[PDB]
Amino acid sequence: HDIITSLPEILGDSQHADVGKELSDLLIENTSLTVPILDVLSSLRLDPNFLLKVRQLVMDKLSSIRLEDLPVIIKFILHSVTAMDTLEVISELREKLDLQHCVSSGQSCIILLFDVIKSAIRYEKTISEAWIKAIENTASVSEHKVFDLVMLFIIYSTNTQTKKYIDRVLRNKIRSGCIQEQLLQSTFSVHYLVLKDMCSSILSLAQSLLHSLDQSIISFGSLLYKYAFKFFDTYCQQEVVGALVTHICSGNEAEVDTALDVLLELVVLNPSAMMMNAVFVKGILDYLDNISPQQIRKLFYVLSTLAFSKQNEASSHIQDDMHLVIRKQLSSTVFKYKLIGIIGAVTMAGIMAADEQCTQVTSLLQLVHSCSE
C-alpha cells in the first residue's frame, strides 16, 4: 500500500502506459487494492482511452468491493464523466448497485455514499437530469429496488429546477403500477437514517400527490404522510398534522376522505405524539361549512377519541369547545345543522363510555332527544 502511493514521484513521463496496463492487470487480479490504485491512476498520465476501459473494468467488479471503499470508487466514477457518456454509465451504475446486500456498520457507509452522490449532483448539473432519465426510461421492469425511490427523493431535496420533472415522473410511475407500497415500505424501514434529513421535500411532494385524482396516487400520498409521521422527529410530525389539517379544510371530497382516514391512522398508530399537536387539529372545527355528515362522523370520532385520553384532562379544553359547537348546531331549525349536532353528540357520547361521564352522556342525550322530538 505504501510503495504504490509513492509511485508518481519516482517514475518519469515515459514508462507510464505499461505501468497503467500492469496496474490494471493487478486491478482485475485483486479487489483489496482498488482504492489506492485508482488514487495513483488518477494522478499518473494516461490516455483517455485507457481510462474508459478502466471505468468499465471497475464497474463490472462493483458488487465485489468490500463496503468501506465503495464510496470512494463512485467518487472516481462520477468525476470521470463527460457530458456525453453520462447516461450509459449512470444507467449501468443504477442497475449494478443494490443497497440490499450491504446492511452502524452498513448504515454509516451508506450515508457517506449518499453524501458523495449529493455532492456530485450539487456540483455538476448534468448528472441530475441524466439520472432521472435512467429511472424514467427504465419504466419497463416492475422489479425496481430500494435505490430508485431514495434517489428520487434526494434529487427532489436538492436542486429544485427538477421538481416539476420529478413530480411528472412519479405520477407516470404510480399510474403505471410500478411504484407501490412494498417498495416505499422497505424504503422507509431501511433508509430512514438517510431520509430523516429530507422531510421538507417529502411533504412538498405529498401535498402535490393528493390534489390529483386516481385513488392509487392518493393512497401513495397517504403512505407518505403515515411513515413520515411514524419514523421522523417531532418537527416533521407537526408538519404532517398541519398539512393534513390543510388538506381537510381546504379540501375536496376524495382528498378530504383520504385525509380523514389518514387522521384515523395517525391517532390509532401513535396517539401520545398526536395529543400534543391536537391543538391544530381542534381549530378545524372553525370550518365545518364544507364537510359532509359521514366525514363529520369520522371527524368527531377522531377528536373525541383523542380527547378522552385520561392524562390530558388538563386540556379538557377541546371537550368544552366540542360541547359548545354541539350546542350551537343542535340549537337550529335547519335540519342540515340538526343532523350534524345529533350525530356529533351521539358519537361523542359513545366514545367517552369506554360517573361524571354518565352525567354528561345523560344530559347530552336528553337534550338531543328533546331537540329531535
Add this chain to the structure above:
Amino acid sequence: MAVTEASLLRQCPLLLPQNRSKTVYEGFISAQGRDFHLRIVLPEDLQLKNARLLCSWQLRTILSGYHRIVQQRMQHSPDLMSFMMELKMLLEVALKNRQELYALPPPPQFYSSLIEEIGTLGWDKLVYADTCFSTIKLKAEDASGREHLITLKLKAKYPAESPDYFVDFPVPFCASWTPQSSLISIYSQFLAAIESLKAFWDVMDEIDEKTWVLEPEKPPRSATARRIALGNNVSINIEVDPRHPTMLPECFFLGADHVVKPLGIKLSRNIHLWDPENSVLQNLKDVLEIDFPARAILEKSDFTMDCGICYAYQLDGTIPDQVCDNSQCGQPFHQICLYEWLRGLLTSRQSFNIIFGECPYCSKPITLKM
C-alpha cells in the same frame, strides 16, 4: 483413512477394542489436552439406535445439558467412527463454554518468571497484585510529578499471549506485544505514551487548579471535556484534542442569550490573537478578555442552584444549564424538566430543533435547543 479400520484409530487413538468381536470399545477420548474415560458397548451388530454408553462422572458433569443431543445423535448418526468425531466436537464446544470452569496456570514457567520480571522492574513500581495472581497493577510518574496506573491481566500463559492492558489515558493505547517482550517493554511503551501526552495532563491540571471546573467533578484521567464556570450562572464547556492540546479547543457558551452574545462576539473578533505557545487559560484570558472566579464558593455561592421545577441538582447526569434571558429570574433549569414543561403549554411553538416559550417563574421568552 477411508474405511473405519484405520480412520477410527487415527481419529480416536485411545479407544481400544477389548472384545474379539469388535463390540466392546473402551478407553479415553481427547479434547483440548484432557483424556476422558469412556466405555461404548455395541449390540451384536453395528447399530447405534441402541447401544450402551457409560462414562466417568467427570464426563457426565461435562456432558450436563447436552444429554439430549448425544441421545439424539446416537440415533441419527450412521457409524461409530463418525459418532466419536461428532461427540468430540460437542465436548469441545462444552468445554469452550466452560472456560470459567477449566482454567489453570503452570507452576514452573509462570510464577518464577513473573517474580523475576517484577524484580526486574523494581518494587517501588508495583502497587497491586491479586491472590490468583492474574491481575497486577503498576505505577509510573510523570516528569510533572503525577501518578498514573496501568492494570495488567495475565493468563495461565503470560509470555505466549498478550496480557490484558487497561490504562486510563484518553488516546487509544497501542502496545506492540511480542513473545520476546515483557512487562518492562510495555512499561517503557507506557512511559513513552505518558511523556507524549504530557502536554494534555499539564493543560487539564492548570484548568482544574486555577478555575472552577464544574461537571467533570473529580475528573478521571480519561476525561477530555471540561465545563468551566465563569461570571455567574453562565458556563463554557471545552473539548480538547490530546495530540494538539495547546491548539484551540471546541468551546461554546451556556447561559443568558443577552449575556452570552458579547462573549461569542468578542471571541470571534479576537480569536486570531489565540496563540498556541501559551497555555489554554493564558490564551483564553487575553482572547475572551475576562477573568475566571477561583473557587468563589463552589459548593454554595448564593443561589438555589436546583432546577426550580424538580428542585434537584444531578438529574441522570444532566446539570442545571438552561437559564432565563432575564436579570430578575436568572433561574436555571434542566433540559428535561423545561422541555416537558414547554411541550405541554398552549403558547409554545416548535421550529426544527428549537422550542420557544415562557419561563415558568417570570413568563418571559425562553428558548430551548434540543
Add this chain to the structure above:
Amino acid sequence: AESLELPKAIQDQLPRLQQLLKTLEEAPPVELQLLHECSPSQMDLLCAQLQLPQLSDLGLLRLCTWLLALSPDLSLSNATVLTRSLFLGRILSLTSSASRLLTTALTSFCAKYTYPVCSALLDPVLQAPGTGPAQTELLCCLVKMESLEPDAQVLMLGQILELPWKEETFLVLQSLLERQVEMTPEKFSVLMEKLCKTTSMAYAKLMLTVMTKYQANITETQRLGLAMALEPNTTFLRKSLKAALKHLG
C-alpha cells in the same frame, strides 16, 4: 439410484420447506428444526430436492443467517452436506472475484461451523483443476477471519498439509502462517518436510515467512532442507532468503 427414502416427516414437509425458501429470495421458522431429523444420507437427498445450490446469493446469506440462529448446533456430518451443496458449485463457477455478498456470507457462516466448512470446501476447490485467483482470494479471506480461533487455525493447517502442493496451496498456507499460529514440533516437522521438497516467488515468500516467524523451532536439518530447496537462482528474493538462512545459523 441408491433408493434412499427421505424421513416420513421430511417427505411430508418438503413443500412447506420449499415455500419459505422461495420467499427468502424476495427469526428462523419451525421448519428448519426438522433438519436435525436427517441422517447425513437423508440430508444429501433432501438438499438436492430442495435445490439449495440454485438459491441466489442473497437467499444464500439469509439462509446462512437462519442456520446460525438454529437451536442446538448441527452435527458435523449434516453441516458438511449443507456446506458442500451451498458453496461448492458457486465457488467453482467463480471467474471474477467473489461478490461482497458472497465473501460476507461465506465468512459469516465459517465463524461458527469452522471445521465442517473448511474440511468440506477447502480440499475440492484447491484440488479442482484450473483453480485461480477468484478461488484463492476466498480461501485467503477465510484464513484471515478474526473468528478463526487459534485451534481452528491449527485444524486448517492440518487439512492444508494433506493437499498436493502447488502455487495456490503456497498462497493460502502463507496467508494462514501470517497469523503466527502455534505449531507442535511434529506438525512443524511435517510442514518443513513438505516445504523442503521451487522456481516461484510464492514459494520463496512462504519459505521466508516460516524462516522468520518460527525461527525458534527450526532445527539444523530443517535449515539445511530450506537451503537446498532455495539453491536455484530463478527463485525471487534469493539474497534475502540467503540472509535469513545465514541468520538461522
Add this chain to the structure above:
Amino acid sequence: RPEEGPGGLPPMLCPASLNICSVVSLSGGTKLLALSAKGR
C-alpha cells in the same frame, strides 16, 4: 456472586479446627464454635 468457575479461597489464619459449627448472629459478626485438634 453462574455460581463459580474456579475455587478461590483464603485462610483465616486460625489453626486446624476439627468439628466447626456456626451460630448466625446478624446483630456483630458471625460467631462459630470450634474444637481445636489439640483439645481446646
Add this chain to the structure above:
Amino acid sequence: LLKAVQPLLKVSMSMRDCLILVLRKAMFANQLDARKSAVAGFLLLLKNFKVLYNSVANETFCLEIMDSLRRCLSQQADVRLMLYEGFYDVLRRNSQLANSVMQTLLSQLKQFYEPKPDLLPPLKLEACILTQGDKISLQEPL
C-alpha cells in the same frame, strides 16, 4: 477562496492536514491549473503559518513543502513566477526559513549567471528560452 477561508486554517489543524492531501495530489494532476493553484495554496500555507505536536516536526514539514517546491523550481514559467512573488511574502513573515529560500534562489540564478569577469554577456539568455519546433517560450523569468 483560500485566502478568504484562511482564518480557519489558522485555528484548526485537522483542516490543514486534510487540505495537504488534496494539494499534494493536485500537484501531479495532469491539468495545468492544478499545479498553479496547488502552488498558490502551498504559498498560502507557508505565508500565514509557522506551525503546519513538537516544533521540530513543524520545521521538517515546512522543509518537505519547500523540497516539493524545489522540484517545482524545475517547471514551466508560470509556476516559477508564482513561486518567486510568493517568496518575498514568505520571507516577510517567515524569517526562520530565510536561508532555505535564498540558496534555493541563488542556485537557480547561478544556472544563468556566469561567475567570471571579462566575459561581456554575463547571462546566457538562450539557455533561458526553450524552443520545441518553432514554438518558442520563456522558462525561468530572470
